A paper describes a structure:
In this study, we identify and characterize the unique cation channel TMEM87A as a Golgi pH-regulating cation channel (GolpHCat), determine its atomic-level structure, delineate its ion conduction pathway, and ascertain its functions in Golgi homeostasis, protein glycosylation, and biological processes, and investigate its contribution to hippocampal spatial memory by employing multidisciplinary cutting-edge technologies, including Golgi-specific pH imaging, proteoliposome-single-channel recordings, cryo-EM structural analysis, molecular dynamic modeling, proteomics/glycomics approaches, and animal behavior tests. The structure of hTMEM87A contains two distinct domains: the globular domain [termed the extracellular/luminal domain (ELD), D38-K213] containing three glycans, N62, N79, and N127, and the transmembrane domain (TMD, Y224-P473) having seven transmembrane helices (7TM). Taken together, these structural analyses suggest that TMEM87A is a monomeric ion channel with a putative ion conduction pathway that can be opened by voltage stimulation and closed by PE. Taken together, these results suggest that TMEM87A might be a voltage- and pH-dependent, nonselective, and inwardly rectifying cation channel.
While we were substituting Cl− with various large anions, we serendipitously discovered that gluconate potently blocked TMEM87A-mediated currents with IC50 of 0.10 µM. Thus, to decipher the binding pocket for gluconate and the putative ion conduction pathway of hTMEM87A, we incubated purified hTMEM87A with 10 mM sodium gluconate and determined the cryo-EM structure of hTMEM87A-Gluconate (hTMEM87A-Gluc) at ~3.6 Å resolution. While the overall structure of hTMEM87A-Gluc was essentially identical to hTMEM87A structure, of potential significance, the observed density indicated that a gluconate ion occupied the hydrophilic cavity of hTMEM87A via electrostatic interactions with R305, R309, D371, and W445, in a manner similar to the head group of PE. Based on these observations, we hypothesized that the extended electrostatic-interaction networks (Y237, E272, K273, S301, K304, R305, R309, S344, D371, Y340, and S415) underneath the NLV, while also mediating the binding of the PE head group, can form a constriction and hence, be implicated in hTMEM87A-mediated ion conduction upon the channel-opening stimulus. To test this hypothesis, we expressed hTMEM87A mutants (Y237A, E272A, K273A, S301A, K304A, R305A, and R309A) and recorded their channel activity. Despite their robust cell membrane expression, current amplitudes at −150 mV were significantly decreased for all mutants compared to WT. Moreover, these residues in the constriction sites are highly conserved. These data suggest that a channel-opening stimulus (high voltage in our experiments) can trigger rearrangements in the electrostatic-interaction networks underneath the NLV, ultimately leading to ion conduction.
Author numbering: 38 to 135, 173 to 192, 203 to 473
C-alpha cells in the first residue's frame, strides 16, 4: 500500500507493474538516476483502465509478459488503454516529457518495460500524485472514518472522566476497566490516524504501525469479552467472589486473544501461505461457543435473581440481555449481508464500497460499548450493584 517506488532497472525481466485504484486527473511521475550512459534504451508503457475489480485482485505479475499479449489479442477484458513507446540513444537522462495522466477514476493497471541494447546500471523512481499529495483513492474514506472515530472516542473518554470525577467518592472495581477499554480504543484510533497521515504526506506506510494497531485491537476485544463473561457469571455482583470461579476458567478463556493475534497480524501482512483464509473460521467458531456459554450463564443468573426476589438488578440484567441479543442479531445480519454481497458476484462491479467490511465492525463495537457505558453510569447510589453479604 505504497505510493513511491524505487527500482534498480537491471533486474530480472525489467517489467514493473502495479494495479491500484486512483482518483480522476492523477499524474504519474517517472525519474531516472545513476551512472553515465553507453547503450541504447527502449521504453514501453501501458496504462489500462478496469471495468470490474476482479481483474485487479487476481492480477498476477508472473504472467505479465503474457497478460500484455493477452491484451493485444483481445481475449482479455474490455476497457480503453493508453500505450506509448520511446527510444533513447544512450541515456538522455535529463528528459522532460516522461499524455500520462488519469482521465477517469477507476481501477488501473500500469505496466512499464525497458529494453537494453548494446549488474546494476540505473535506478527508476515512480510516483503517483492526485488532487491530494499522495492519498490515492480507497483510503480517503477510511482516513475520514478513522478521524471521526478518534473524535468520538475522545468524547467518550471525556464523558467517562467527568462522570468519574463527579462521583469519585465510591466506585466499583468492575467500573474501572471501562476506562482501560476506552484508553485502548484511544491508542488504536490514534495510531490509525497517525499512520494514515504519514502515508498521505510522505507516501510510505509506517514500518510496523499496523502490527501494533492489530495487537491493540486484539487486546481490547479480548478484554471486552472477558469483562462480559465475568459480568454474566455474576462474580462479585450476585454470588460472592469465590476462591476459584474465574481461576482457570475466565483467564483460561483468554486464549481467544491468541487466536486474534494470529488473524489480525496475518490479515495485515497478507502472505497467502494457505493459512490466510483458514485462520478466520476457528475464531468465529470460538466466538459462537463463547456466546453459547454466555447466554446459558445469563439465563441461570436471571433464574437465581428471580428466586430471591431482587428488583433493582433484575431490570438491569434484562436490559443487558436485550442489548447483547440485539447486538448478536445485528452482527449475524451484517456478516451474512457482507458474504452475500461481496463474495458471490461474478466480479465486483461496485468498487466504491469495499472499505466498509473493515469499518463496520469497529462502529458496531463502539455502539455496543457506548450502550454498556450508559447502563453503568456512576451515581450517588452506586452500591446496589454489589454482593452485599
Ligand atoms: C550520449 O547521449 C547524448 C545525448 O543524447 C548524445 O548527444 C551528444 O551531445 C551533443 C549535444 O547536442 C549532440 O549534438 C551534437 O552537437 C554537436 C555540436 O556540439 C554537433 O556538431 C553534432 O552534429 C551533434 O548535433 C551529439 O550528438 C553528441 N555529442 C557528443 C560529443 O557526445 C551523445 O552523442 C551520446 N554519446 C554516445 C557515445 O552515444
Ligand atoms: C488536474 O489537476 C491539476 C493539478 O491539481 C490541475 O492543475 C491546476 O489547474 C488550475 C486550473 O486549471 C490551475 O490554476 C493550477 O495552476 C494548476 N496547477 C498547477 C500546479 O499549475 C488541473 O487544472 C486539473 N484538471 C485538468 C483537466 O488537468
Ligand atoms: C521498442 O519496443 C517495442 C515493443 O516491443 C517495439 O515495438 C515492436 O517493434 C517491432 C517492430 O516491428 C515489432 O515487435 C512490433 O511491430 C512492434 N510493436 C508494435 C508496433 O506494437 C519497438 O519497435 C521498439 N523500438 C525500436 C525497435 O526501435
Ligand atoms: O473478525 C472481526 O471482524 C470481528 O472481530 C468480529 O469477529 C467480531 O468481533 C464478532 O464476531 C462479533 O462479536
Amino acid at each position: 500500500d505504497r505510493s513511491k517506488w524505487h527500482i534498480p532497472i537491471p533486474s530480472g525481466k525489467n517489467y514493473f507493474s502495479f494495479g491500484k485504484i486512483l482518483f480522476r486527473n492523477t499524474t504519474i511521475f517517472l525519474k531516472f538516476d545513476g551512472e553515465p550512459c553507453d547503450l541504447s534504451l527502449n521504453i514501453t508503457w501501458y496504462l489500462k483502465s478496469a471495468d470490474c475489480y476482479n481483474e485487479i485482485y487476481n492480477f498476477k505479475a508472473e504472467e505479465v509478459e503474457l497478460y500484455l499479449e493477452k491484451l493485444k489479442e483481445k481475449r482479455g477484458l474490455s476497457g480503453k488503454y493508453q500505450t506509448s513507446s520511446k527510444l533513447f540513444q544512450n541515456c538522455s537522462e535529463l528528459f522532460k516529457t516522461q499524455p500520462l495522466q488519469t482521465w477517469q477514476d477507476a481501477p488501473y493497471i500500469f505496466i512499464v518495460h525497458i529494453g537494453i541494447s548494446s549488474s546494476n546500471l540505473f535506478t527508476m523512481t515512480v510516483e503517483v500524485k492526485g488532487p491530494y499529495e499522495y492519498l490515492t483513492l480507497e483510503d480517503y474514506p477510511l482516513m475520514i472514518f478513522f478521524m471521526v472515530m478518534c473524535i468520538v472516542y475522545v468524547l467518550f473518554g471525556v464523558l467517562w472522566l467527568a462522570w468519574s470525577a463527579c462521583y469519585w467518592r465510591d466506585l466499583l472495581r468492575i467500573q474501572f476497566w471501562i476506562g482501560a477499554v476506552i484508553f485502548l480504543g484511544m491508542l488504536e484510533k490514534a495510531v490509525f490516524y497517525a499512520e494514515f497521515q504519514n502515508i498521505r504526506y510522505k507516501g510510505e506506510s509506517v514500518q510496523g504501525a499496523l502490527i501494533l494497531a492489530e495487537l491493540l485491537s486484539a487486546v481490547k476485544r479480548s478484554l471486552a469479552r472477558t469483562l462480559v463473561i465475568i459480568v454474566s457469571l455474576g462474580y462479585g455482583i450476585v454470588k460472592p467472589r469465590l476462591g476459584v470461579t474465574l481461576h482457570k476458567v475466565v483467564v483460561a478463556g483468554a486464549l481467544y486473544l491468541l487466536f486474534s493475534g494470529m488473524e489480525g497480524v496475518l490479515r495485515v501482512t497478507g502472505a497467502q501461505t494457505d493459512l490466510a483464509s483458514l485462520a478466520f473460521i476457528p475464531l468465529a467458531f470460538l466466538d459462537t461457543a463463547l456466546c453459547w456459554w454466555i447466554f446459558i450463564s445469563l439465563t441461570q443468573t436471571m433464574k437465581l435473581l428471580k428466586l430471591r426476589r431482587n428488583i433493582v438488578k433484575l431490570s438491569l440484567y434484562r436490559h443487558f440481555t436485550n442489548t447483547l441479543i440485539l447486538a448478536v442479531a445485528a452482527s449475524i445480519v451484517f456478516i451474512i449481508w457482507t458474504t452475500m454481497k461481496f463474495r458471490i458476484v461474478t466480479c465486483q462491479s461496485d468498487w466504491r464500497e469495499l472499505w466498509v467490511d473493515d469499518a463496520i465492525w469497529r462502529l458496531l463495537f463502539s455502539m455496543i460499548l457506548f450502550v454498556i457505558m450508559v447502563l453503568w453510569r456512576p451515581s450517588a447510589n452506586n452500591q446496589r450493584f454489589a454482593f452485599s453479604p
